């Protein structure tokens, strides 16, 4: 895997170039955010059990056929594996948020997830609804203050929303 | 420095401010360089020819090139020395005809193609509407370009993959009355209480139907299970105080010819609204 | 989707050429016509539950035989699926005014419909009587403007001619 | 690639857990040191050609047989001289990559993995590249903690060569 | 193949939602900035022959081992195919700029282009550099910063269109990698 | 775009998006004298179909300038032009003279008929025409059997139909179609399973065994495997590809079996450490950790989630999962 | 004959469908963009005798070696056929403005040209160099209107990319 600092280095080694003066000034801004990025990863991780469970609770209220006999989440092994997957996706979205690059997200979670759910019969349109419910529980948790100093984080919540949309289109 | 309208505009340093085609040479410090070029190559006696790029040529200059003209003052020197030509002297536009070559002040030699009224100097084009101005004293000809004469021998050091590839940031578009609903689902259900089912949204009206059976948010409230033993008697009140009112006094709105009735029977759950509720009013209890 | 963009791109892809001057001239028609057909798509998207339910019982006001035994409007589930299937068709007309062509109606509503409404024995003249009621309910200055109602009705009788 | 960011992700993904404050502090310390490292990398980039021409000449002064002996391994001809100023620029570019990333990651993936195999095969001496690196440690002109970050990755490559 | 308007339709169809209100304003902005998009697609297809030849020549000038015996662009049959491999890639990028969505570029061009280039033996580092040269040419004609041509436009800013078409060219390098 | 959901479509995002959009139907018996642009499009469309999206240069396109002119007034395009272009040297050089007989036989099924050979008897009926009468009648049996006038109007261009259900083929022929047609930016010179020299469906087209379909543009889209016998009788060798059967006690212990195909295995990235290992780089015996990339596994269901993490954490790319 | 009308009628015929609402919208763009190009073509009509004379001198100025004995511009008779062959290209772009697309260039001027010129030993770069001159002497608010110059330039670059 490689983060956002290692991303521009790998793009520059393949050209055989030193980094520019403009490119160092663009990596100073990524360090200048710095603490605001670590606030989003702190808020998402600290409420990780309640984000997964209460957005599984709201999925079975709107699609109650998934827990009927003959549904894809009806049994204890088949329900516990469903909550386990929703915690796997929230894990690698927080990994992609601390790194600034969606490379650990697809190389270790997403590549082969569509092929897995097509061999098992898991409804892929219902997985993306569970992904989109953890999204707006987390982008509403991102832009509340709650012991953070007041400022503008609207550029880092568009990046966190883009990692949830990436995980949702790799399964739908 | 001073105002350009002093001494008329007869001064050489103030004339190009007056003939306002090249305003970038005084907005930047480029006019110090071309005065230092003709010191350095002794062009003050013999006649020559300049091709000044206009305003708009400086504006269409690329951001991967305009950065490299700031971090390298040697690159600004020979680019401005690449516009001063000493082949034909004070040459007009009619002597720039055919195809041929031209010797710059510093750089190798640059080929021109001049075909009638369109004249190219090699990645440049002379706009001939204002280009035949000749100064008598310190004598040269000045013509106007629309692009800088950029030789390819200078700019193999530049590229767009340095970091000048343009990127726009996209931000999320959520409304503040919607993510205030969604913060209550982040807490666990022992401390979030009733707010733990806040993530379910409004389904369409057929999704609560008997094939699909989507559960409303009110099934998770205690207001669905309000089934008491006690009951109001309604006969112990004064006559005229018990009020009742029907929904519509019509046979055809209470029940249509199909069973899609909003008021009678089990099809009262098939409303397009009334899927979610306001239980972020109270408490996290 | 069959659209204005996807038509002129596919025509210049089968010929193997760049977007010509006549392929940019078609997208300019998509600009001058978008004002009328986005007014109809916004008027429909705000008042859709009242337009669907007004047309859902215009089926059963013309065909009261559908509540007879064995028919398609017997019980509560079958009228829930009937008001759903009308709301599906009104969503696809909202999608066609947004895109600008008959794309979403063709791929999602019309293709395969003759083989389903005959296998399941749903009378296709009753998936029409709700669509034909909405086309004559529209008052041309009251709900939308003049050219917004031209676009709204032209996608409404494309669906009628595709079920007939 | 070894980075303070990616080593925190890899030690939590190996255990299979979420990023705790054990991992949020290892990337907080990368952000404190990043200001010294980014000034050390902007200065080594802007004075690269001075440091490349000088360090190659500093090897020809200590080992003058490398400009004398015939053969393909030595910088006798103009072709072996051009392949030496290319090798110094590879060692210098990996140092500025390690300052930008924040760890000894880009010079692990690109330079020091397989380095003892390509030196023994093409018959290059690691003592040539040490003296080329002792020059850059003595001539970058940096000061303080800016020089502490630059000399930490220069001293890392001298330990693999020796 | 989806355009910009039919992309928000397949996003609304996933949740049985009508398109209206919040989503129609981002599409009414597409119509209002729509004259710029036709005025920018015209700038690329007017120079589409000089762009391709200069991209394959500049790929060769920096890496002149490609025209040696053993290089991939050696003979005349191979050079004429490399001049046509890039003329198609530029054609599909100009479709995605006209549509406003990268679905025609991913469906018809990039899906399968990777295993095309590993069966033939095309060097992916050299083909990325030929795309990179086309990226710099496309931003220069859109933002009028071309040093060899000066196209006439109305006055205004089109940075969002240049940052859009730059993201289409980076999908080409990420696919074949 | 990939997937099956989000658009209510599976075949256009399986590589067939360009092919599901054209007709190219030649609506008039002769080309009109005066105009060339309509019929130049049909000739470029029947070059792209019959040659399988190959590059015909201008010095080679002038070698078929005669037929192109017989078609413009006095020949059909389905018959008599695709038949004339199949007897040319440009078709014969790259589709017949390069491969064995059974390799040339299924390239003609794709190019002329738009499908794949179903079983051995589809191969065997076409090799018998070549053994008795030569190449000139061998390409006529693709045109002059019953199938060709049945499925194509004799003024349209052929199109791909081996995936459809009205082309009454076996379901192993569906999986074989997506081995020979990989999207619209590919030819059979640009196919990794036939590189204009191989037999693309050699064991699989004869025995009618089905393959796992990998979509073009997927993550593990570069997955290819070799072929080797395994038994003592045929003098085979063990340990190259995983089996396709799941026979014994391990088939149903740990649940239902699957067959997983991995693509990219490199030397950097094995350990739990985010970076390469510095040092020796190879053990004594000098071999890699994975001597082949493109490995395959047969795994149970209770071992599928530990294996999934063991693949991706070590650099691999899951190409396909298929229940045995 | 590629036009905006011809592209949608041929695409409705290829799918066997009637003219939809996605097809009449493309004819609307032909109406809006018509006033731009139809007065550029009026400008090219009455002033073609001087535009080809100016463009004719602009290729013998660049390639003065054509007047050598043994080249394509030896005598007055071979010179007269070059001013004729550039007057044809100015008539075929006058046709492309009133049609609305690259039809009349693709049939009578471009298809077949690169084998006529190769066989008859005529350099295509000099048939280019007179087309790129009238693209360059055109300044947009003097010679025509601001939008007529966009259409007039759009066909000259289409002719240039075809020869080059
Ligand atoms: C190891 C654990 C660790 C953390 C969790 C963070 C925590 C943290 N955040 C900030 C500092 C900050 N944090 C934020 C972030 C926000 N403010 C808001 O109103 C938004 C809701 C939210 C963005 C999503 C902002 C905006 C600042 C800077 C205050 C300012 O400049 O206005 C600071 C002080 C630095 C400063 O003041 O500049 C610290 C220590 N840093 C750490 O080292
Ligand atoms: C632990 C102890 C405990 C209680 C005391 C009750 C308290 C209580 N009552 C209501 C909810 C309510 N409570 C009332 C009651 C009244 N309104 C009147 O006009 C009368 C004065 C009064 C009855 C005598 C009504 C009418 C509602 C429904 C409110 C509404 O949604 O309209 C709710 C909201 C939850 C729900 O709607 O189900 C709660 C927590 N519940 C508890 O769990
Ligand atoms: C996105 C596009 C889209 C559509 C247009 C519909 C099309 C459609 N409608 C129905 C299904 C139906 N349509 C009706 C309709 C009626 N009953 C009557 O008495 C009248 C004839 C009429 C009301 C207008 C009924 C009753 C069913 C259910 C059939 C059944 O219950 O067997 C079905 C069968 C599947 C099901 O059970 O829902 C389908 C595919 N579905 C779609 O996905
Ligand atoms: C989105 C799609 C859409 C439509 C197709 C129309 C359709 C429509 N019309 C009416 C409602 C009505 N429509 C009319 C008709 C008319 N009124 C006049 O002044 C004219 C003379 C005449 C035009 C023919 C009348 C008189 C009513 C009120 C009576 C009724 O309930 O139908 C209603 C009920 C809601 C209401 O207006 O109270 C609807 C949905 N409106 C829409 O929003
Ligand atoms: C729809 C999209 C689409 C494409 C992108 C191309 C993709 C493509 N390119 C080539 C074929 C080729 N592509 C290249 C290109 C290159 N080699 C290099 O060294 C350069 C890096 C690069 C030029 C930029 C070359 C040289 C060949 C020919 C290889 C050969 O002839 O052996 C072929 C095989 C041609 C054949 O089989 O006859 C295909 C299908 N074709 C398409 O239909
Ligand atoms: C080895 C030999 C060699 C070459 C052939 C050129 C090739 C070349 N051209 C450009 C760069 C460019 N190329 C063009 C294209 C054009 N400009 C015009 O004046 C014409 C209208 C049109 C086709 C001729 C444009 C517009 C740019 C960017 C800026 C500009 O020149 O105005 C770039 C930079 C790409 C980048 O930034 O990464 C390169 C390498 N350079 C070389 O070193
Ligand atoms: C009618 C069909 C049609 C064409 C023939 C072409 C031509 C064209 N371009 C623009 C108009 C424009 N074109 C641009 C684009 C640019 N300007 C710049 O300074 C950049 C260099 C470049 C890319 C960012 C801009 C900024 C406008 C102004 C109008 C607007 O902002 O929408 C207009 C609108 C001007 C008017 O209203 O008259 C037209 C007609 N585009 C079309 O839509
Ligand atoms: C109606 C559409 C139409 C056209 C577009 C042209 C195209 C065209 N031009 C020429 C023909 C020609 N084109 C040139 C041109 C040149 N020679 C030079 O010295 C310069 C290189 C260049 C000046 C522009 C000459 C000299 C001929 C005549 C060839 C000859 O005499 O051998 C011919 C051969 C027949 C002839 O005219 O003799 C044709 C078909 N003619 C058409 O009928
Ligand atoms: C329809 C076809 C058509 C063209 C291709 C052009 C071509 C053209 N330009 C000029 C004539 C001219 N063209 C210009 C050029 C310009 N003037 C300016 O104000 C701008 C700065 C600049 C635009 C580049 C000038 C200054 C003259 C007069 C001098 C001359 O060239 O004789 C003439 C002679 C007639 C005249 O205008 O006096 C012609 C035919 N005009 C046309 O009608
Ligand atoms: C790299 C980390 C990783 C990933 C990505 C992963 C995917 C994965 N998901 C699985 C199952 C599953 N995934 C789901 C999930 C769902 N089904 C639904 O109905 C819902 C819509 C949805 C979630 C709420 C279910 C129900 C199963 C069990 C399927 C079965 O047992 O048949 C299995 C089968 C093994 C098992 O857990 O029993 C794997 C390997 N496993 C991993 O270790
Ligand atoms: C980015 C990581 C990286 C490193 C470290 C690297 C080293 C490297 N240096 C090499 C050669 C060389 N290195 C030298 C350098 C020297 N010899 C002298 O006499 C001087 C004392 C000294 C330089 C100061 C010479 C002369 C050769 C050519 C040797 C040959 O061709 O046999 C070669 C042989 C391949 C080739 O010919 O290019 C490699 C792989 N390559 C890499 O890609
Ligand atoms: C679920 C338990 C199970 C089954 C069903 C099974 C079948 C099985 N039979 C095999 C071979 C074999 N099977 C036969 C059997 C025969 N050949 C003949 O000519 C006769 C007609 C026939 C029996 C009389 C032979 C000779 C081989 C060795 C094949 C060879 O080496 O070429 C092999 C290949 C492995 C090996 O060579 O040992 C398998 C997997 N193995 C199992 O573990
Ligand atoms: C069973 C005995 C055996 C074979 C046959 C074998 C081949 C083999 N060669 C490999 C890589 C390689 N092979 C080359 C070879 C070359 N590249 C070039 O440009 C040259 C033309 C050419 C030789 C000079 C390179 C550069 C790699 C590394 C590719 C990479 O890791 O990205 C790899 C990938 C894993 C690794 O990095 O070691 C394998 C498995 N491994 C084995 O254990």
Q: Which whole-number Å values give the CA distances from F194 to B254, D112, F103, F126, F188, in the listed order?
A: 70, 39, 9, 20, 6
Helix, strand, or coil here: E67? helix
How many beta carbons lie within 10 A of that of residue D159, not counting itself?
Answer: 8
- The H-assigned helical ranges of chain F are 37-50, 58-61, 65-74, 82-86, 89-95, 101-108, 120-133, 135-138, 146-151, 172-180, 203-207, 304-312
B142 CB-side CA count, 13 A = 16
Strands B118-120 and B110-115, how do they pair?
antiparallel
Helical (H) or strand (E) element with F281: none
Question: What does each C-alpha distance from F152 to F73, F78, F113, F160, F317 come to in angstroms?
Answer: 21, 8, 9, 11, 41
Please state, as a whole number, how many other Cβ atoms lie within 10 Å of the Cβ of residue F200: 22
Residue F292 Cα distances to D114, F211, F213, F240, G30, angstroms: 20, 21, 22, 9, 60
CA distance D99 to D103: 7
DSSP 8-state code for residue F100: -
**Would you state the structure tokens that stand for residue F123, as one six-digit string?**
């191969």
Consecutive H or E run containing F259: strand F258-262
Q: Which residues contact B8 (CB under 8 A, 6 or more apart)?
A: none
Write out chain E residues lying below 8 Å of F217, CB-based.
Answer: 106, 110-114, 175
Task: Measure the CA–CA gap between G133 and F125, rounded to whole angstroms.
Answer: 64
Cα-Cα-Cα-Cα torsion G6, G10, G12, G16, nearest 10 degrees, comes to 150
Helix (H, G, I), strand (E, B) or coil at D141: coil
Is the CA virtual torsion G18, G22, G28, G30 positive or negative?
Answer: negative
- Residue whose Cα lies nearest atom 42 of ligand 4: it is C143
The minimal CB distance from G161 to the residues E42, E49, E152 is found for E49
Pairing outcome for strands B140-145 and B48-53: parallel
Report DSSP state, residue D111. Answer: I
Q: Which two tokens stand for residue G9?
A: 């009628």
CB atoms F25 and G14 under 8 Å = yes
Residues G144 and G47: their CA atoms lie apart, in Å, by: 12
- b/e per residue B221-259 (b: at least 16 CB within 10 A): eeeeeeeeeeeeeeeeeeeeeeeeeeeeeeeeeebbbbb
Handedness of CA E58, E59, E63, E68 (dihedral sign): negative
Place of tokens 């021998």: B153
Read off the DSSP letter of residue A140. H
- Tell me the residues of chain E between 15 and 74 that have a Cβ less than 8 Å away from chain A: 15
Contact E2, C1 (CB under 8 A): yes
Q: Are G111 and F40 in contact (CB under 8 A)?
A: yes
How far apart are the CA of F224 and the nearest CA of chain E, in angstroms? Answer: 10
Bridge partners, residue B140, by sequence: B48, B135
Contacts of G14 (CB under 8 A, 6+ apart): F22, F23, F25
The C-alpha atoms of residue B23 and residue A16 are separated, in whole angstroms, by 38
Chains D and G contact (Cβ–Cβ under 8 Å for 3 or more pairs): no
Pocket flag, ligand 12, residue F248 (CB < 6 Å): yes
Local structure of residue F196 (DSSP, 8 states)? S
Q: Quote the CA–CA distance of D136 and D92 in Å, as a whole number.
A: 9
Whole-angstrom distance, CA of residue B188 vs CA of residue B206: 31
Cα of E4 vs centre of ligand 5, distance in Å, is 30
Cα B172 to Cα G3: distance, rounded to the nearest angstrom: 42
Segments in G33-147 forming alpha helices (H): 34-46, 51-60, 76-99, 103-108, 113-119, 124-129, 131-134
Max CA pair span of chain A: 62
* 3-class DSSP state of F298: strand
CB contact under 8 A, F41 and C13: no
d(CA B87, CA B84): 10
Using CA atoms, how far residue C72 sits from C83, C123, C126, D132, in Å, is 12, 8, 10, 88
**Cβ contact C119:E30 at 8 Å:** no
| F296, containing H or E segment | strand F296-299
User: Which H or E run includes E142?
Assistant: helix E124-142
- The CA distance from E141 to E49, in Å, is 13
Does the distance separating the beta carbons of F191 and E110 come in below 8 Å? no
Count Cβ atoms below 10 Å from residue D65 Cβ, excluding itself. 9
- Considering only CA atoms, which of F113, F179, F173 is closest in space to residue F143? F113
Distance CA F54, CA E112 (A): 15
Cα–Cα–Cα angle for C71, C73, C77, rounded to 5 degrees? 120
SS3 assignment for chain B: CCCCCCCCCCCHHHHHHHCCCCCHHHHCCHHHHHHHHHHHCCCCCCCEEEEEECCCCCCCCCHHHHCCCCCCHHHHHHHHHCCEECCCCCCCHHHCCEEEEECECCCCCEEEEEECCEEECCCCEECCCCCCEEECCCCEEEEEECCCCCCCCCCCCCCCCCCCCCCCCCCCCCCCCCHHHHCCCCCCHHHHCCHHHCCCCCCCCCCCCCCCCCCCHHHCCCCCCCCCCCCCCCCCCCCCCCCCCCCCCCHHHHCCCCCCCCCCCHHHHCCCCCCCCCCCCCCCC
Phi then psi dihedrals of residue B43, to 5 deg: -95, 10
Angle, vertex CA B39, rays to CA B37 and CA B45, nearest 5? 110
Let me know: does D48 contact D55? Beta carbons within 8 Å: no
d(C-alpha C154, C-alpha C145), whole Å: 14
Please state the φ and ψ torsions of residue E33, each to the nearest 5 degrees. Answer: -95, 30
* Closest CA relative to residue B145, chosen from B243, B61, B70: B61
Cα–Cα distance for residue pair B199/B205, rounded to 1 Å: 18
Cα separation, E145 vs B67, whole angstroms? 13
| Cα–Cα dist B267/B261, whole Å | 6
- Identify the residue among G6, G29, G96 best suited for mutation to test binding to C, counting C beta carbons within 10 A and taking the highest: G29
Q: How far is E111 from chain A (nearest CA, A)?
A: 15
- Going A86 to A89 to A95 to A96, the CA torsion angle's sign is negative
Experimental technique of record = cryo-EM
Cα-to-centroid distance, A159 and ligand 1 (Å): 17
Under 8 Å between Cβ of F243 and F298: yes
Q: Tell me the C-alpha distance between A92 and A169, whole Å.
A: 15
What residue of F is the nearest CA neighbor of D8?
F274
Mutate to test the pocket of ligand 12, among F237, F246, F248, F324 (most ligand atoms within 8 A of CB): F248
Would you report the helix, strand and coil content of chain F in percent, each value rounded to 5? 35, 5, 60
Report DSSP state, residue F321. Answer: E
Contact G32, C28 (CB under 8 A): yes
> Phi, psi (5° rounding) for residue G42?
-70, -35
With a Cβ cut-off of 6 Å, ligand 6 is lined by B 62, 123, 152, 156, 159-161; E 47, 50-51, 54, 57-58, 61-62, 132-133, 136-137, 140-141, 146-149
Alpha-carbon torsion (B164, B166, B167, B168), positive or negative: positive
Residue with tokens 């129609």: E24
The two three-digit tokens of residue E37, written as one number? 């998009």
Nearest alpha carbon to residue D4 among D112, D99, D110, D145: D99
- F187 Cα to chain E: minimum distance (Å): 8
- Centroid of ligand 10 to alpha carbon of B24 (angstroms): 64
Q: At what angle do helices C126-137 and C48-62 cross, to 10 degrees?
A: 120
E71 CA distance to ligand 5 centroid (A)?
A: 14
F51: left (phi over 0), alpha (psi -120 to 50) or beta: alpha
Interchain proximity E108–F18, CB inside 8 Å:
yes
Question: Considering only CB atoms, which chain A residues are within 8 Å of B180?
Answer: 140
Ligand number with the minimum distance to the CA of G42: 9
**Pairing, β B110-115 against β B133-135:** unpaired
Angstrom distance (rounded) from CA F318 to CA F311: 8
Beta-carbon contacts of residue G153 (< 8 Å; ≥ 6 apart): E46, E152, G135, G138
Q: Which pairs from A152-156 meet CB under 8 Å and 24+ separation?
A: A153/A36, A153/A39, A153/A40, A154/B171, A154/B172, A155/A33, A155/B169, A155/B171, A156/A33, A156/A36, A156/A37, A156/A40
Q: Any CB–CB contact under 8 A between B68 and chain A?
A: no
Tokens 């002040």 locate to B105
- Determine if ligand 13 sits within 6 Å of the CB of residue F288: yes
Helix D48-62 vs helix D126-139: angle between axes, to the nearest 10 degrees?
130
Ligand 6 atom at minimum distance from B150 CA: 31
CB B15 within 8 A of CB B133: no
Residue whose CA lies nearest to ligand 6 atom number 14: E137
Of the candidates F3, F4, F7, F18, the residue with the CA atom closest to the CA atom of residue F182: F18
Residue with tokens 């795309």: E131
CB within 8 Å of B237: residues ≥ 6 apart: none
Most G CBs within 10 Å: which of C27, C29, C107, as the mutation test of the G interface? C29
Q: D8: number of CA atoms within 13 Å, CB side?
A: 25
- Name the residue among F184, F186, F217 with its Cα closest to residue F16: F184
For residues B216 and B208, the answer to whether their CB atoms sit within 8 Å is yes
Contact F258, F250 (CB under 8 A): no
Q: Which residues of E touch A168 (CB under 8 A)?
A: none
Q: Assign E71 to helix, strand or coil.
A: strand
Q: Chain B residue with minimal CA distance to C75?
A: B259
Residue F99 carries which DSSP code?
A: S
Best G111, G114, G162 residue to mutate vs chain F (most F CBs within 10 Å): G111
- Ligand 5, atom nearest to E127 Cα: 21
F and B touch with 3+ CB pairs <8 Å, answer: no
Q: Whose structure tokens read 């955010």? A: A33
Q: Specify which residues C130 forms β-bridges with.
A: none
- Give the bridge partners for B48, in sequence order: B140
CB-based burial of residue A162 (10 Å sphere; 0-12 exposed, 13-18 middle, 19+ buried)?
middle
CB contact under 8 A, F18 and E175: no
Cβ pair E14, F6 in contact under 8 A = yes
User: For residue F298, which phi and psi values (nearest 5 degrees)?
Assistant: -115, 115
Please give the distance, rounded to the nearest whole angstrom, from the Cα atom of residue F289 to the centre of ligand 12: 32
Which secondary structure element, helix H or strand E, spans residue C106, and what is its range?
none
Sign of CA dihedral G45, G50, G56, G59: negative
Radius of gyration of chain C (CA): 18
Q: How many other CB atoms are there within 10 angstroms of residue D120's CB atom?
A: 10
Contact by Cβ (8 Å): D136, D92 = yes
Whether residue F323 lies within 8 A of chain A, CB to CB, comes out as yes
E93 within ligand 5 shell (Cβ under 6 A): no
Q: Would you kindly state where each structural domain of chain E is located, as residue ranges?
A: 1-177
Quickly list DSSP for A32-90. Answer: HHTHHHHHHHHHHHHTHHHHHHHHHHTHHHH-GGGGSTTSTT-SHHHHHHHHHHHHHHH
**Alpha carbons D1 and D17: distance in angstroms, whole number:** 21
Q: What are phi and psi of D50, to 5 degrees?
A: -65, -40
Instruction: Dump the DSSP string for F27-73.
Output: -SSS--TT--HHHHHHHHHHHHHHTTS----HHHHGGGHHHHHHHHH
Q: Which chains touch C (3 or more CB pairs under 8 A)?
A: B, E, F, G
- At residue F319, the 3 state secondary structure works out as strand
CATH architecture of G1-164: Orthogonal Bundle (1.10)
What is the C-alpha end-to-end distance of chain G, expressed in Å?
A: 22
Q: Are A126 and A65 in contact (CB under 8 A)?
A: no
The closest-lying atom of ligand 13 relative to the alpha carbon of residue F293 is 40
Q: How far apart are CA F187 and CA F174, in angstroms?
A: 19
CA distances from G109 to B6, E57, F87, F226, G162 (A): 60, 29, 33, 53, 10
Pocket residue to mutate for ligand 5, from F53, F180, F217, most atoms within 8 A of Cβ: F53
What top-level class would CATH report for the domain E1-177? mainly alpha
Q: What are phi and psi of B27, to 5 degrees?
A: -75, -45
By the 8 A CB rule, do B100 and G61 touch? no
What is the distance between the alpha carbons of residues B64 and B75, in angstroms, rounded to a whole number?
Answer: 13
- Look at chain C and count its residues: 164
B222 lines ligand 2 (CB under 6 A): yes
Q: Whose CA is nearest to atom 16 of ligand 8?
A: G82
In angstroms, rounded to a whole number, what is the distance separating the alpha carbons of residues G15 and F158? Answer: 16
Asked whether F264 and F320 are in contact (CB, 8 A), the reply is: no
Interval between CA B32 and ligand 9 midpoint (Å):
36
- Helices (H) then strands (E): counts for chain E: 9, 0
Instruction: Find residue F323's DSSP bridge partners.
Output: F258
- Decide: C63 in ligand 3 pocket, CB within 6 A: no
């Amino acid at each position: 895997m490689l983060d956002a600092f290692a991303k521009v280095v790998a793009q520059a080694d393949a050209r055989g170039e030193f980094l520019s003066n403009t490119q160092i000034d663009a990596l100073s801004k990524m360090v200048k955010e710095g603490n605001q990025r670590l606030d989003i990863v702190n808020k998402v991780t600290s409420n990780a059990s309640a984000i997964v469970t209460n957005s599984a609770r709201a999925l079975f209220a709107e699609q109650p056929q998934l827990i009927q006999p003959g549904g894809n989440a009806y049994t204890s092994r088949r329900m516990a594996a469903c909550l386990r997957d929703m915690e796997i996706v929230l894990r690698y979205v927080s990994y992609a948020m601390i790194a600034g690059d969606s490379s650990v997200l697809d190389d270790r979670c997403l590549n082969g997830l569509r092929e897995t759910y097509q061999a098992l019969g898991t409804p892929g349109s219902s997985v993306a609804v569970a992904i989109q419910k953890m999204k707006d529980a987390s982008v509403a948790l991102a832009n509340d203050t709650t012991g953070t100093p007041i400022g503008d984080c609207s550029s880092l919540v568009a990046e966190l929303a883009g990692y949830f949309d990436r995980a949702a289109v790799s399964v739908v | 420095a001073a105002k350009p309208y002093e001494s008329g505009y007869i001064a050489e340093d103030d004339f190009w401010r007056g003939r306002g085609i090249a305003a970038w040479v005084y907005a930047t410090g480029a006019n110090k360089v071309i005065a230092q070029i003709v010191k350095d190559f002794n062009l003050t006696d013999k006649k020559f020819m300049v091709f000044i790029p206009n305003d708009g040529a400086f504006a269409r200059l690329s951001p991967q090139l305009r950065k490299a003209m700031m971090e390298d003052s040697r690159l600004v020197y020979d680019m401005l020395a690449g516009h001063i030509f000493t082949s034909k002297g004070s040459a007009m536009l009619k002597d720039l005809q055919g195809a041929g070559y031209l010797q710059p002040a510093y750089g190798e030699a640059i080929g021109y193609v001049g075909t009638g009224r369109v004249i190219k100097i090699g990645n440049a084009q002379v706009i001939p509407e204002s280009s035949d101005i000749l100064r008598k004293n310190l004598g040269f000809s000045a013509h106007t370009l629309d692009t800088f004469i950029v030789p390819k021998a200078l700019t193999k050091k530049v590229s767009i993959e340095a970091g000048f590839s343009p990127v726009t940031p996209a931000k999320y578009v959520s409304t503040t009355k919607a993510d205030l609903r969604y913060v209550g689902a982040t807490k666990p259900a022992a401390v979030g209480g009733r707010r733990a089912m806040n993530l379910m949204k409004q389904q369409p009206f057929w999704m609560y139907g008997p094939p699909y059976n989507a559960v409303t948010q009110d099934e998770y409230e205690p207001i669905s299970a309000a089934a008491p033993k006690a009951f109001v008697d309604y006969q112990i009140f004064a006559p005229g105080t018990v009020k009742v009112s029907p929904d519509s006094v019509n046979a055809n709105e209470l029940n249509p010819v199909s069973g899609m009735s909003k008021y009678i029977g089990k099809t009262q759950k098939l409303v397009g609204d009334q899927g979610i509720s306001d239980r972020s009013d109270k408490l996290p209890m | 989707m069959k659209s204005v963009i996807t038509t002129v791109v596919s025509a210049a892809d089968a010929a193997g050429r760049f977007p010509s001057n006549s392929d940019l001239e078609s997208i300019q028609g998509n600009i001058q016509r978008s004002a009328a057909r986005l007014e109809a798509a916004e008027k429909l998207a705000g008042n859709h539950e009242a337009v669907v339910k007004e047309a859902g019982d215009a089926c059963f006001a013309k065909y009261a035989y559908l509540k007879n035994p064995g028919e398609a409007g017997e019980n509560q589930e079958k009228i829930n699926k009937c008001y759903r299937d009308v709301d599906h068709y009104m969503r696809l007309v909202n999608y066609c005014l947004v895109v600008g062509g008959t794309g979403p109606l063709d791929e999602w509503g019309i293709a395969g419909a003759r083989e389903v409404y005959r296998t399941l024995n749903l009378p296709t003249s009753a998936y029409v009587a709700s669509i034909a009621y909405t086309r004559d309910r529209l008052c041309v200055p009251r709900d939308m403007s003049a050219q917004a109602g031209v676009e709204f009705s032209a996608y409404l009788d494309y669906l009628i001619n595709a079920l007939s | 690639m070894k980075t303070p960011i990616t080593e925190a992700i890899a030690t939590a993904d190996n255990q299979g857990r979420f990023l705790s404050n054990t991992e949020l502090q290892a990337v907080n310390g990368r952000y404190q040191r990043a200001t010294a490292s980014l000034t050390a990398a902007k200065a080594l980039t802007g004075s690269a050609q001075r440091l490349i021409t000088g360090a190659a000449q500093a090897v020809y002064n200590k080992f003058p047989y490398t400009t004398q002996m015939p053969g393909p391994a030595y910088a006798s001809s103009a072709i072996g001289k051009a392949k030496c100023a290319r090798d110094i620029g590879y060692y210098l570019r990996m140092v500025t990559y390690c300052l930008v990333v924040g760890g000894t990651g880009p010079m692990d993936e690109y330079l020091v993995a397989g380095l003892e195999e390509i030196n023994r095969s093409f018959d290059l001496s690691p003592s040539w590249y040490i003296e080329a690196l002792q020059y850059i440690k003595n001539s970058h002109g940096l000061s303080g903690q800016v020089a502490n970050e630059a000399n930490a990755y220069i001293d890392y490559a001298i330990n693999t060569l020796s | 193949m989806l355009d910009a308007f039919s992309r928000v339709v397949v996003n609304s169809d996933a949740k049985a939602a009508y398109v209206g209100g919040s989503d129609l304003q981002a599409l009414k902005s597409f119509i209002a900035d729509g004259n710029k998009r036709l005025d920018a697609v015209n700038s690329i297809v007017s120079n589409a022959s000089c762009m391709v030849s200069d991209a394959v020549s500049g790929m060769i000038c920096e890496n002149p081992g490609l025209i040696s015996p053993g290089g991939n662009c050696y003979t005349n049959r191979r050079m004429a195919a490399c001049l046509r491999d890039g003329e198609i890639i530029l054609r599909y990028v100009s479709y995605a700029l006209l549509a406003g969505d990268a679905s025609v570029l991913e469906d018809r061009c990039l899906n399968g282009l990777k295993e095309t280039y590993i069966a033939l033996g095309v060097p992916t580092n050299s083909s990325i550099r030929a795309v990179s040269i086309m990226k710099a040419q496309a931003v220069a004609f859109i933002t009028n910063t071309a040093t060899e041509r000066k196209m006439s436009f109305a006055a205004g800013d089109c940075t969002s269109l240049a940052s859009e078409v730059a993201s289409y060219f980076d999908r080409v390098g990420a696919a074949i990698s | 775009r990939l997937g099956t959901v989000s658009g209510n479509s599976s075949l256009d995002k399986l590589g067939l998006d360009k092919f599901l959009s054209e007709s190219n139907r030649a609506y008039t018996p002769r080309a009109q004298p005066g105009f060339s642009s309509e019929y130049e499009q049909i000739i470029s469309a029947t070059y792209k179909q019959l040659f399988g999206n190959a590059y015909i240069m201008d010095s080679e396109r002038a070698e078929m300038a005669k037929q192109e002119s017989m078609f413009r007034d006095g020949q059909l395009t389905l018959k008599d032009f695709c038949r004339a272009l199949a007897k040319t040297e440009q078709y014969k050089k790259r589709f017949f003279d390069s491969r064995p007989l059974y390799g040339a036989i299924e390239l003609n099924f794709k190019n002329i008929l738009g499908r794949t050979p179903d079983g051995l008897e589809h191969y065997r009926a076409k090799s018998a025409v070549y053994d008795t009468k030569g190449y000139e009648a061998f390409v006529d049996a693709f045109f002059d059997d019953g199938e060709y006038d049945e499925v194509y109007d004799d003024y349209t261009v052929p199109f791909y139909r081996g995936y459809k259900t009205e082309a009454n083929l076996s379901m192993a022929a569906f999986t074989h179609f997506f081995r020979m047609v990989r999207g619209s930016s590919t030819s059979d010179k640009a196919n990794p399973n036939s590189m204009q020299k191989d037999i693309p469906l050699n064991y699989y087209g004869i025995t009618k065994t089905p393959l796992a379909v990998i979509a073009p543009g997927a993550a593990g889209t570069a997955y290819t495997e070799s072929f080797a016998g395994t038994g003592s009788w045929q003098s085979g060798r063990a340990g190259l590809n995983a089996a396709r059967v799941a026979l014994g006690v391990p088939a149903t212990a740990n649940g239902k079996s699957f067959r997983v195909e991995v693509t990219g295995y490199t030397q950097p990235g094995f350990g739990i450490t985010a970076g390469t290992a510095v040092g020796k780089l190879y053990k004594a015996n000098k071999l890699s950790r994975y001597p082949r990339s493109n490995k395959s596994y047969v795994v149970g269901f209770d071992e599928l989630t530990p294996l999934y993490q063991r693949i991706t954490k070590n650099g691999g790319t899951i190409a396909s999962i298929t229940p045995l």
